[PDB]
């Protein structure tokens, strides 16, 4: 078990933002620094709780003897996902990143996948110094830069004052070059052959000063305090007396608003989805789209829409997503031609009827009709085409074929060796899945260069009142306050 | 260009023309099964005379097409099915006699009366006579039943049979067959591929070799039944001579299911009845159909249908629409399945739901096929399939499992066996007769032989292979074996002897691929994800191909198995050794029970 | 930026937590067939970067080994690890880490 106590860093967690010498410099530079006088929790363990890994979570250690090893950085920690872990011992670094399930610590379930590994010295620097306390301090920063993990260390030893007022510099070490995504962090205690500060690192301005010897002996914060702000401003560590002007002041935007016209084109896209009297597959139909409303509920929430797969363009990331004309056809088939419906493969009504081509962008939709598009003793209005001389074009009709002719002999009508390619479409209401009648639309998409003027909803959004806001009116980006008025606009 | 391509179109034509009319008329037979009304019928008949005359008018103009200029295996079974004429390839004269003689038959065998000594008694048909065969064991009343139906059927038959072998042999020619047995054993025709042709002559080699390995147990069984016989009958048995005709245990030598209470071992104790505990839980006809759906999702079948649950009649609506419920139920068409059942609360009806549950789990299977290859790949597949799906619902061990039989329960080898005996005696009293029956169609049907050296012959080799002793002997005039209602119509017993095996061969190596341990009977085929793909997999094909691969994929061999037989009767056969000691071994073609 | 993010999660549509592939519940990927059949713009170019960091950190790797002997006290130029440049190297007394 660990416990919950509550403690402030002070000054404490300063390390060499890069690897270039200065002396006697007062050099600013601003990256993830530990705040200064920033509550960090420390847990004293005699267990492994979890914690957030967000921007940069800083660790130090205090102990009496050897029981704290094994860093692990990874979202979830778990989950065969990569977790990585940075377990060490008195002989080398025994860097374990790689891609586990359980290792409670080398010592692992599964091995999984894997990826950098590197020993070369013991990454605690296990050295007992003379006091039996010298309590190994384990200062270091763990961030994540463009997915290049950095660590820095620094063992300054401290007796007995924790988290102590003492001013230390974290020398950088190696980085792992890893470029995975890390959300949680958990330390994973070792196994038997006042530990814990966690002070996670927002990003804010430094001011550092550097000894003659290079060494940064001290340094401020530039947001801790006014004074701090001032020292930070004036890029020294002395003030004299005297009023100074060291940044401005305004009221970050509570929230964001976007606003648009009423939205209101009115297209029949339900409309062109109740039409009773449908068309064959033989004369597919096509409707011309423009300043329309692309209210993609309709095709969502009605209709069971048996079918919904598209490989061109994401049906998620559609609303907002805007064209001009859309080809959408419609035409009703059976269970396994919805199926059978794609871009590039082999099927006969695909193949014969309407070919849907590779470079093929847009959605084909379907769902069931069984007692719309049917009625009990037959339902013969609906027709299909079935031969032709090879594989058909994409979006093409081919209405009116004649009669198909076959044995290289004449023929005059319906006969021997020369049928009528339009073959009876029998729907009934008692039709077991496969054989249902299916309607079906494929609708296209084109990216076109004209005016899209089909978008979607816009995202109207309420506007507050008397506060500071984003505000997007009718394509007027810009932050300010609003309120009531009383001009006389025209 | 090439005929391929012509047969195809055609082909496809054909398919979906004969689909819809299918449905039309599957939706007439449907609503045969249901309605009997006038009007019905009137619509029923007209329907399917519309589909002959399709049928028969797409053959004709498939009749163009030749035979050697087609490569593709699909197509080669495509054609073989669809060059079958029948009656169509003689003329309008003969056809118009055929169909004369049809109609002759079916009303004969339909208004067939025999009237016993006392004129006040009319025995109609099957029906009273079953129940008395059943209910009585009367050897005058049924002995003289018999062979009075024998003398008047026979004696009007003896000359029709004679036509119809002729005509038979007629038909033959015109499919450019040798004889009308080869000409059923066209359904077992391969050809045009290497190492896996097989002609009709092999069928023959393989009953052959099916005998000779069935002998010995069958004499074994046969000797066991008479003696049972003869423990109620010390006077009408010779023992070491073979059994009479009129002794095999029912009214036409067929099923040997009334030799029940002579017969089982220990009737003291009670058999396996769950009918009284599906009356105490109060179990439904509807439920009974979900856990048979639920069983068959437990080897991984698809689903049913919501349609199958939604049109199809499962319990009596009322009595005065009266419904047939003879055990069968064929698809509509276009994915369309319905059942018929007389349904009540008890074991058999549950064992006929299972049977016809398999029958329509293949009948869904082969769904994606076209018309002309839309059956099975015989004429027994699915009958065969059906009594496996009963068979693994009668183990004892899934009413463990589905909780209807109390946990409590003890196997004991005395029920073990007398389970193994009913549902052995049930099926195995069929299997004599029908290959005694369907060689000697073959036999008159190839030429061979002379027309005063049948009914003689007939009862000797009856006598000399199974023990079946004519009591009257009849002189050549008479058909004794041909009063029966499935050779009234000319259907072959093929299809019976096939379903017995294939079935057999079917749950054996189910049995053998479910990880069982023990004896093979008393075990189910259930909650087998492997075993259920393993059925799919051959399940899906169909008639496009073949048996033999689906039964290399399904075994492992190549040909017929004549294991099934030996092993599903282990215990049986392991406890008649030991009591075979004091038994007499062998049987006497020259004795007969009026030879005094 | 520099991001992998492996993982076959189902990506639902709308608000129903659907899992699998069809109705409003879709696979993260979808396909990416390559045959010689299609245009210029979809055949299967197989493309590879380059990623540098011109930085001041110890180079490792240098290209060209070319290495003259060091001079100090004298008016040079300098290359040391691309730090082109020209002055005076005198050696010094610092406290390099």
């Given at each position: 078990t660990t416990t919950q106590s509550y403690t402030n860093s002070f000054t404490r967690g300063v390390y060499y933002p890069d690897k270039v010498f200065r002396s006697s410099v007062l050099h600013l530079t601003q990256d993830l620094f530990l705040p200064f006088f920033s509550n960090v929790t420390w847990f004293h363990a005699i267990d492994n709780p979890v914690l957030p890994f967000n921007d940069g979570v800083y660790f130090a250690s205090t102990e009496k003897s050897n029981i704290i090893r094994g860093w692990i950085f990874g979202t979830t920690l778990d989950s065969k996902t990569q977790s990585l872990l940075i377990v060490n011992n008195a002989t080398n670094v025994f860097i374990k990143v790689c891609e586990f399930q359980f290792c409670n610590d080398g010592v692992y379930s599964s091995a999984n996948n894997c990826t950098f590994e590197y020993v070369s010295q013991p990454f605690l620097m296990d050295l007992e110094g003379k006091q039996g306390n010298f309590k190994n301090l384990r200062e270091f920063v763990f961030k994540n830069i463009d997915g290049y993990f950095k660590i820095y260390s620094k063992h300054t030893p401290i007796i007995?004052?924790?988290?102590?007022q003492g001013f230390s510099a974290l020398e950088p070490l190696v980085d792992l070059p890893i470029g995975i995504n890390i959300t949680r962090f958990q330390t994973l205690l070792a196994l038997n052959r006042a530990d814990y500060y966690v002070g996670y690192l927002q990003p804010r301005t430094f001011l550092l000063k550097y000894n003659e010897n290079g060494t940064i002996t001290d340094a401020v914060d530039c947001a801790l305090d006014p004074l701090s702000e001032t020292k930070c401003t004036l890029k020294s560590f002395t003030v004299e007396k005297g009023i100074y002007q060291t940044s401005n002041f305004r009221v970050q935007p509570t929230e964001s608003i976007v606003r648009f016209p009423?939205?209101?084109?009115?297209?029949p896209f339900h409309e062109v989805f109740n039409a009773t009297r449908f068309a064959s597959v033989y004369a597919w139909n096509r409707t011309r789209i423009s300043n329309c409303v692309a209210d993609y509920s309709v095709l969502y929430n009605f209709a069971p829409f048996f079918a919904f797969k598209c490989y061109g363009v994401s049906p998620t990331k559609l609303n907002d997503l805007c064209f001009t004309n859309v080809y959408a056809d419609s035409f009703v088939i059976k269970g396994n031609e919805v199926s059978q419906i794609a871009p590039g493969q082999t099927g006969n009504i695909a193949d014969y009827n309407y070919k849907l081509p590779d470079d093929f962008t847009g959605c084909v939709i379907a769902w069931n009709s069984n007692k719309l598009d049917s009625k009990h003793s037959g339902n013969y209005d609906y027709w299909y085409r079935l031969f032709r001389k090879s594989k058909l074009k994409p979006f093409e009709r081919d209405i009116s074929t004649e009669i198909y002719q076959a044995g290289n002999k004449p023929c005059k009508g319906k006969g021997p060796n020369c049928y009528f390619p339009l073959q009876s479409y029998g729907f009934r209401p008692t039709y077991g899945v496969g054989h249902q009648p299916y309607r079906v639309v494929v609708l296209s998409f084109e990216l076109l260069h004209a005016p899209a003027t089909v978008c979607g909803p816009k995202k109207s959004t309420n506007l507050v009142k008397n506060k500071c806001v984003n505000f997007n009116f009718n394509g007027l980006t810009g932050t300010g306050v609003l309120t009531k008025s009383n001009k006389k606009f025209l | 260009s090439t005929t391929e391509e012509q047969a195809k179109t055609f082909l496809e034509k054909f398919n979906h023309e004969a689909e819809d009319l299918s449905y039309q008329s599957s939706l007439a037979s449907w609503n045969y099964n249901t309605n009997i009304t006038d009007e019905n019928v009137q619509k029923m008949n007209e329907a399917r005379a519309k589909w002959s005359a399709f049928y028969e008018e797409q053959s004709r103009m498939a009749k163009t097409y030749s035979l050697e200029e087609i490569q593709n295996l699909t197509l080669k079974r495509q054609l073989k099915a669809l060059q079958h004429s029948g009656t169509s390839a003689l003329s309008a004269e003969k056809s118009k006699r055929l169909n004369t003689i049809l109609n002759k038959m079916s009303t004969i065998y339909s208004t067939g009366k025999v009237l016993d000594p006392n004129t006040q008694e009319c025995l109609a048909l099957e029906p009273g006579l079953d129940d008395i065969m059943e209910n009585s064991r009367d050897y005058n009343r049924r002995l003289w039943a018999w062979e009075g139906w024998r003398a008047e059927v026979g004696k009007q038959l003896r000359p029709l049979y004679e036509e119809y072998v002729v005509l038979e042999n007629e038909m033959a020619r015109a499919n450019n067959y040798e004889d009308y047995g080869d000409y059923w054993r066209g359904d077992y025709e391969v050809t045009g591929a290497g190492d896996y042709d097989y002609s009709r002559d092999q069928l023959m080699k393989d009953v052959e070799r099916t005998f000779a390995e069935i002998k010995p147990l069958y004499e074994q069984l046969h000797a066991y039944v008479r003696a049972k016989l003869m423990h109620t009958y010390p006077s009408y048995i010779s023992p070491t001579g073979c059994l009479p005709a009129?002794?095999?245990?029912d009214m036409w030598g067929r099923f040997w299911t009334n030799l029940y209470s002579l017969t089982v071992?220990?009737?003291?104790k009670p058999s396996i009845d769950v009918t009284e505990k599906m009356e105490n839980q109060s179990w439904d006809a509807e439920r009974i159909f979900k856990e048979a759906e639920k069983f068959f999702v437990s080897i991984s079948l698809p689903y049913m249908t919501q349609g199958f649950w939604d049109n199809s009649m499962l319990t009596?609506?009322?009595?005065?629409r009266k419904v047939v419920c003879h055990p069968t139920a064929w698809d509509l068409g276009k994915g369309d399945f319905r059942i018929k059942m007389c349904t009540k609360v008890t074991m058999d009806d549950f064992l006929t739901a299972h049977h016809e549950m398999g029958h329509i789990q293949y009948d869904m299977a082969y769904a994606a096929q076209p018309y002309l290859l839309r059956n099975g790949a015989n004429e027994g597949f699915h009958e065969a399939v059906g009594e496996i799906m009963s068979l693994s619902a009668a183990t004892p061990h899934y009413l463990k499992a589905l909780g209807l039989l109390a946990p409590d329960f003890h196997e004991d080898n005395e029920t073990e066996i007398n389970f193994l005996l009913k549902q052995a005696l049930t099926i195995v009293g069929t299997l004599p007769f029908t290959y005694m029956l369907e060689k000697w169609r073959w036999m008159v049907f190839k030429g061979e032989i002379p027309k005063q050296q049948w009914m003689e012959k007939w009862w000797e080799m009856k006598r000399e292979i199974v023990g079946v002793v004519e009591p009257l002997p009849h002189d050549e005039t008479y058909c004794d074996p041909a009063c029966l209602f499935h050779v009234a119509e000319d259907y072959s017993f093929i299809r019976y002897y096939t379903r017995t095996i294939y079935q057999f061969q079917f749950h054996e190596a189910l049995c053998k691929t479910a990880k069982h341990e023990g004896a093979l009977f008393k075990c189910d085929i259930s909650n087998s994800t492997e075993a259920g793909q393993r059925l799919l997999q051959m399940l899906r094909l169909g008639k496009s191909e073949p048996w033999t691969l689906a039964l290399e994929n399904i075994v492992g061999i190549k040909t017929m198995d004549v294991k099934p037989l030996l092993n599903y009767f282990e215990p049986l056969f392991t406890w008649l050794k030991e009591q075979n000691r004091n038994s007499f071994v062998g049987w006497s073609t020259e004795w007969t029970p009026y030879s005094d």
């Open positions: 007995g004052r924790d988290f102590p009423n939205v209101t084109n009115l297209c | 009129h002794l095999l245990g071992p220990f009737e003291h009596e609506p009322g009595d005065g």
